[PDB]
A paper describes a structure:
Cytoplasmic incompatibility (CI) results when Wolbachia bacteria-infected male insects mate with uninfected females, leading to embryonic lethality. CI is caused by linked pairs of Wolbachia genes called CI factors (CifA and CifB). Protein-binding experiments and expression of cif genes in yeast have shown that CifA binds its cognate CifB specifically and rescues CifB-induced yeast growth defects. CidBwMel consists of a region, which is predicted to contain two PD-(D/E)XK (pseudo) nuclease domains (residue 1-751; hereafter CidBwMelND1-ND2, ND: nuclease domain) and a C-terminal deubiquitylase (DUB) domain.
Of note, the ND1-ND2 region of CidBwPip_I(b/2) (a CidBwMel ortholog from the Wolbachia strain wPip Tunis line, hereafter CidBwPip(Tunis)ND1-ND2) expressed well in E. coli and shares a sequence identity of 71% with CidBwMelND1-ND2. We successfully determined a crystal structure of CidBwPip(Tunis)ND1-ND2 in complex with CidAwPip(Tunis) (specifically CidAwPip_I(γ/2)32). The structure of CidBwPip(Tunis)ND1-ND2 is very similar to the model for CidBwMelND1-ND2. (The residues at the interface are well resolved in CidAwPip(Tunis)-CidBwPip(Tunis)ND1-ND2 with good electron density). Substituting the CidAwPip(Tunis) residues at its CidB-binding interface with the corresponding ones from CidAwMel abolished its ability to bind CidBwPip(Tunis)ND1-ND2 and neutralize the CidBwPip(Tunis)-induced growth defect in yeast. Thus, the structure of the CidAwPip(Tunis)-CidBwPip(Tunis)ND1-ND2 complex accurately captures the CidA-CidB interaction mode and is biologically relevant. Among the positions that show divergence, residues 118, 125, 149, 150, 341, 342, 399, and 400 of CidAwPip and residues 242, 243, 253, 254, 257, 451, 452, 460, 461, and 462 of CidBwPip map to the binding interface of the two proteins. These variations create distinct interaction surfaces for each of the four known CidAwPip_I variants. Similarly, each of the four CidBwPip_I variants has a unique combination of residues at the CidA-binding interface. His-tagged CidA variants I(α/1), I(γ/1), I(β/2), and I(γ/2) cannot pull down GST-tagged CidB variants I(b/2), I(b/1), I(a/2), and I(a/1), respectively, which supports the hypothesis that natural sequence variations affect binding interactions between CidAwPip and CidBwPip from different strains.
Numbering used by the authors:
A (entry chain A): 2 to 127, 133 to 274, 288 to 427
B (entry chain B): 4 to 151, 161 to 645, 649 to 747, 750 to 758
The structure:
């Protein structure tokens, strides 16, 4: 299949291990599994692509452990020790331990694990000094493993073979440049207490770009949630072009919803297009992760019902040039409402209804002379575009017409 | 620019010629399909039917059209999906009616406007101007045609006498007369000469009818501004909420006119022509680039909209499916996008890490399109590693096959007439990738093993089979066979030369066969057993031939680091690069059999791919086109001949924040079969470089610098030593080509 499809088959299989009483935790931890495996690009899928049977049972035992979790995020320290054990639960470790010690900054085990790999690779060889040959074998081995990422070339000196030591400032700047989520956390703890706030700000600005990748968002969540004065950070971000917007959409698509709630409540600016895109992004994410429906919906209603954003919500429902800026948002909300692939309480469906209806009432009151077209446009977005979780060969436009009837 | 429809409506033919010339540079694969069904006619129809909505034309400038379908062939009496497009423009208060005929064929029967078409036209003109005087109307008939692909002409027919200014019959009329009579092989003189019955004339009058296009409820003036952005979420919303709903509406609005008087219309090519036309209406205002892939089993189109030289704008990939579910069409669009760096030039004109994918089926009543976002990054496929991994893991064979097939040049058609070209490219690519791989094998059990490569020379000198052996020291051995459809020998390869401690060492075989349908089949890997049991059981089954060890090629990787970077304008660094490549291939010249320019190019292509540097290497890369004009004689004939310019190999770095100069390196490759053929091959290569130096706008979006390096390379098959295997210029300065911005 496609690489994306292989990622989800591994994501969905690793999601079976997640078991918790609260439905919100299970579903937030499922998003972390997709982040760990990779959604739009490969993350740890590179190492677990061929894992089958007992190899997958090892990862099943790791992610089902409460100690490897911290709320809905992965405990990197716990993972680092587990992924460097010889065997847990009687099951051998199928991962490459040196690569895991590098990725999770298990600095006590990096060098002894690399020497094991170096010795077994040297012994497979037949004019060059034995010292120079070892330097050659070390370079050939490190260059091979470096194909999977620059982290695997980070800790081992190529001239002496000794474990490299780094200043926290240098390792922090390198982990951001490497888009290395686990590395950003390790060096932050070793940073000076006065350098912490200044360093986090630099990282947020650098990765809050339009060219961002999903790997940037974990770093952004960690850095934002540890910034003390989010106010002063929001001022510097606004000076950067689309810095606020880029930080927002990155955490939304990666399901860092608690990080955005705290961000939107502080300074209860961004452009009108930014406003409309936040809603479009959330609504899409809602469909890509339907078990997080409530959380995403709640974030939409905060962007919508923010009194300071009154000028933005009115233009959002302003019908102009045979389109309304939020036709998709409405359409995607309706699709969620009619979701029969996942069990939902009838109460949930109902709150989901009055959720939409209150938004349509705002559009009816704001522009009543354009409200007739608004209706045609909404059903247009529901019959012309196919979305995830939307069933085939059923008219979702009839459902919108049902809501319009109740509205009047 | 000034606008294609604008220059056409105003009668500015030279302004239309220069404008259409710029669109042909934007869509380098447009001409390959102008003779495929109604691709070209629907293209121009789209441009006209959407011009009012784009504010290109005013409501005063009325546009009337008609699809003049060809019908049955006079030679074999079979249905044709081709047609001509008759379009006329009338502005109220003006006496000029500009009439246009668009067709693939330069002088197709019925291409001229007919008398009945003139009556059907003036009928539509008066639906708004009832008492209009037709005698005061002056008709200006024009022709626009392109065929082959190599020629594009715009003609203003001379003024003609009354009743001679219009032809007797259009293409559709000629088809109806033949159907009304019995013979389908009636010539024009026959048809024109026969007197027609009054009932037959009524059917002719009911057949010819014109329709009018007008502005819609949705203006599309700024539709390309919405796509010239770097925000994937914005571009996604604009396509899903405004752009595609409009295209779906307009195509479905004129849906009945498309299917009328036509049988077995090519929906793939007509749907793609409609999309290209929509884009062509903005060609004069924006730097658009369209990469069309309409080869058999391909229905993709990828484009990128920019104002000037933005490097982070979001590409869009659309897959058109005539009879497929919308999700299926999106899957195909996502699959194209993941491999967009191999296939397309779009990842060269933008450095965006994401692409907006769109799957479109115009025929569906519900869910005609679906849009999603896919990551865009260049992948490094480890051929030798995946070969070892595919022995215990299923599905890697698909990726291995896709790796070899997708890197085939799109110029070479995958038919029976180019079987040897396809086989030469696949084997040469596979050789360069595997022979020039410096990395060891990453074993499954937390270990690494160095790989010594071998290549086998079959006893039959003229056998189309590439056989290589990869020995992972301390681990298993993999024998790779890439055989032609008839090279199915199953004799065992002697591995006695391989120094193998017995261990748990197994010998594996992976056999690949290119069939007559041009599909590469990779059989299930077979364990041939332990090394010692393999040698004893095949004691009298060893294939006649020699197993030649591949030399170490690690210095080529280090040399390419200097050549691709600081030494890209250094002729001596390039000279040393090919001297080392020559030093590696010389012990293998007989076993490899570089018997064609395709094999030579693919060996180098696989060599530059496997090496970390260059970041990107492309084969048979189209840099652009050249347009030579001819003017003739009122009768105003403008003829444009198009000649393509391609680079055999283009080596590019990746744009980085500190250095945006991709250091483009281009190689013109030729093969000399004999030492006497050498001088002619070198001169031919030097002549092609001189023509490549006439191209500029093709090299400008590929780099931020202002120079390109071009070198002529000749493979000397009869070279005595390695110093003369690959012939490189000795320098007795013509490789650095400054770009005009």
């Amino acid at each position: 299949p496609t690489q994306k499809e292989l990622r989800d088959t591994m994501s969905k299989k690793l999601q079976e291990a997640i078991k918790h009483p609260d439905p919100a935790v299970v579903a937030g931890r499922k998003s972390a599994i997709k982040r760990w495996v990779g959604v739009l690009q490969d993350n740890f899928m590179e190492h677990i692509k061929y894992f089958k049977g007992d190899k997958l049972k090892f990862l099943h035992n790791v992610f089902q452990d409460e100690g490897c979790w911290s709320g809905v995020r992965l405990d990197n320290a716990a993972l680092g020790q587990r992924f460097t054990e010889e065997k847990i639960g009687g099951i051998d470790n199928p991962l490459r331990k040196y690569e895991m010690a590098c990725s999770y900054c298990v600095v006590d085990k990096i060098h002894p694990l690399f020497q094991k790999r170096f010795e077994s690779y040297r012994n497979k060889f037949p004019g060059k000094t034995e010292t120079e040959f070892g330097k050659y074998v070390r370079n050939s081995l490190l260059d091979s493993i470096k194909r999977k990422g620059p982290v695997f070339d980070f800790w081992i000196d190529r001239e002496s073979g000794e474990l490299k030591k780094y200043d926290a400032v240098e390792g922090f700047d390198s982990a951001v440049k490497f888009k290395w989520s686990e590395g950003v956390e390790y060096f932050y703890n070793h940073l000076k207490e006065e350098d912490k706030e200044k360093k986090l700000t630099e990282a947020i600005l650098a990765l809050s770009r339009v060219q961002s990748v999903e790997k940037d968002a974990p770093i952004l969540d960690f850095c934002v949630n540890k910034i003390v004065d989010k106010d002063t950070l929001l001022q510097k971000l606004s000076q950067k072009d689309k810095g606020v917007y880029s930080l927002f959409v990155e955490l939304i698509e990666s399901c860092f919803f608690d990080t955005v709630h705290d961000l939107v409540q502080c300074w209860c600016i961004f452009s009108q297009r930014d406003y409309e895109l936040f809603l479009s992004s959330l609504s899409d994410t809602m469909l890509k992760n339907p078990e997080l429906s409530v959380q995403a919906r709640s974030l939409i209603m905060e962007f919508w019902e923010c009194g300071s954003l009154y000028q933005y919500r009115k233009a959002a429902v302003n019908t102009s040039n045979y389109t309304v800026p939020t036709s998709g948002v409405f359409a995607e909300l309706i699709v969620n409402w009619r979701r029969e692939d996942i069990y939902k309480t009838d109460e949930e469906k109902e709150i989901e209804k009055k959720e939409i209806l209150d938004m349509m009432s705002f559009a009816k009151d704001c522009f009543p002379e354009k409200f007739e077209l608004f209706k045609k446009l909404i059903i247009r977005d529901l019959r012309l575009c196919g979305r995830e979780g939307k069933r085939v060969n059923v008219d979702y436009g009839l459902f919108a017409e049902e809501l319009f009837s109740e509205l009047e | 620019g000034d606008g294609l429809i604008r220059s056409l409506v105003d009668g500015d033919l030279e302004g239309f010629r220069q404008g259409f010339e710029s669109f042909l540079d934007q869509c380098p694969s447009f001409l390959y399909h102008v003779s495929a069904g109604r691709f070209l006619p629907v293209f121009f129809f789209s441009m006209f039917s959407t011009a009012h909505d784009a504010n290109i034309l005013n409501a005063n400038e009325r546009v009337y059209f008609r699809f003049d379908n060809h019908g049955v062939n006079p030679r074999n009496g079979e249905n044709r999906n081709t047609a001509n497009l008759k379009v006329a423009v009338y502005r109220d208060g003006q006496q000029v009616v500009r009439c246009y005929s668009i067709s693939d064929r330069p002088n197709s029967d019925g291409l001229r406007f007919s008398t009945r078409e003139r009556n059907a036209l003036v009928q539509e003109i008066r639906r708004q101007n009832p008492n209009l005087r037709e005698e005061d109307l002056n008709f200006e008939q024009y022709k626009v045609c392109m065929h082959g692909a190599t020629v594009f002409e715009v003609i203003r027919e001379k003024d003609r006498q009354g009743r001679d200014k219009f032809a007797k019959y259009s293409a559709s009329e000629i088809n109806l007369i033949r159907r009304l009579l019995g013979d389908h092989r009636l010539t024009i003189k026959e048809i024109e000469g026969r007197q027609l019955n009054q009932n037959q004339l009524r059917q002719l009058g009911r057949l010819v009818n014109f329709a009018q296009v007008a502005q819609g409820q949705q203006g599309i003036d700024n539709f390309m501004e919405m796509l010239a952005s770097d925000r994937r979420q914005d571009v996604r919303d604009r396509i899903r909420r405004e752009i595609l709903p409009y295209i779906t509406d307009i195509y479905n609005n004129y849906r009945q006119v498309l299917e009328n008087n036509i049988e077995n219309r090519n929906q793939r090519f007509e749907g793609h022509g409609f999309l290209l036309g929509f884009l062509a209406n903005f060609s004069h205002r924006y730097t658009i680039g369209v990469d069309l892939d309409l080869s058999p089993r391909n229905s993709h189109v990828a484009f990128l909209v920019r104002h000037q030289v933005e490097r982070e704008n979001i590409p869009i990939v659309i897959n058109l499916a005539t009879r497929a579910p919308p999700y299926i069409a999106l899957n195909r669009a996502r699959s194209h996008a993941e491999r967009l760096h191999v296939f397309s030039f779009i990842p060269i004109h933008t450095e965006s890490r994401n692409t907006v994918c769109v799957g479109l089926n115009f025929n569906l009543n519900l869910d005609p399109f679906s849009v999603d976002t896919v990551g865009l990054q260049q992948d490094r496929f480890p051929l030798v590693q995946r070969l070892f991994e595919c022995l215990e893991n299923e599905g890697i064979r698909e990726n291995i096959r896709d790796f070899l097939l997708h890197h085939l040049p799109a110029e070479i058609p995958r038919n029976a007439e180019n079987y040897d070209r396809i086989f030469d490219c696949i084997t040469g690519f596979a050789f360069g990738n595997s022979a020039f791989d410096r990395h060891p094998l990453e074993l499954e059990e937390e270990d690494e093993a160095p790989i010594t490569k071998y290549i086998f020379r079959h006893g039959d000198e003229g056998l189309r089979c590439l056989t290589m052996v990869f020995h992972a020291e301390g681990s298993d051995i993999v024998i790779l066979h890439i055989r032609a459809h008839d090279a199915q020998q199953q004799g065992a390869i002697n591995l006695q030369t391989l120094n193998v401690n017995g261990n748990d060492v197994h010998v594996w075989e992976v056999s690949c066969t290119l069939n007559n349908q041009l599909e590469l089949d990779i059989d299930l890997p077979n364990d041939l057993g332990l090394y010692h049991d393999y040698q004893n059981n095949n004691a009298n089954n060893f294939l006649a031939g020699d197993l030649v060890q591949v030399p170490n090629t690690e210095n080529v990787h280090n040399t390419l680091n200097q050549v691709v970077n600081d030494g890209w304008k250094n002729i001596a660094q390039h000279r040393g690069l090919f001297q080392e490549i020559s030093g590696a291939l010389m012990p293998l010249v007989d076993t490899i059999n570089v018997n064609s320019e395709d094999k030579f190019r693919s060996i180098l292509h696989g060599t530059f791919y496997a090496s970390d540097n260059p970041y990107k290497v492309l084969a048979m890369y189209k840099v652009g086109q050249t347009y030579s004009l001819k003017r003739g004689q009122g009768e105003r004939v403008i003829l444009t001949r198009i000649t393509e310019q391609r680079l055999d190999l283009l080596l590019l770095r990746q744009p980085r924040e500190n250095d945006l100069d991709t250091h483009p390196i281009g190689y013109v490759l030729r093969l000399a079969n004999n030492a006497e053929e050498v001088g002619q091959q070198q001169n031919d290569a030097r002549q092609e470089i001189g023509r490549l130096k006439k191209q500029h706008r093709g090299f400008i979006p590929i780099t931020s610098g202002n120079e390109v390096v071009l070198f002529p390379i000749v493979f000397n098959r009869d070279a005595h030593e390695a110093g003369n295997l690959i012939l490189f210029p000795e320098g007795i300065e013509e490789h650095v080509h400054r770009l005009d911005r």
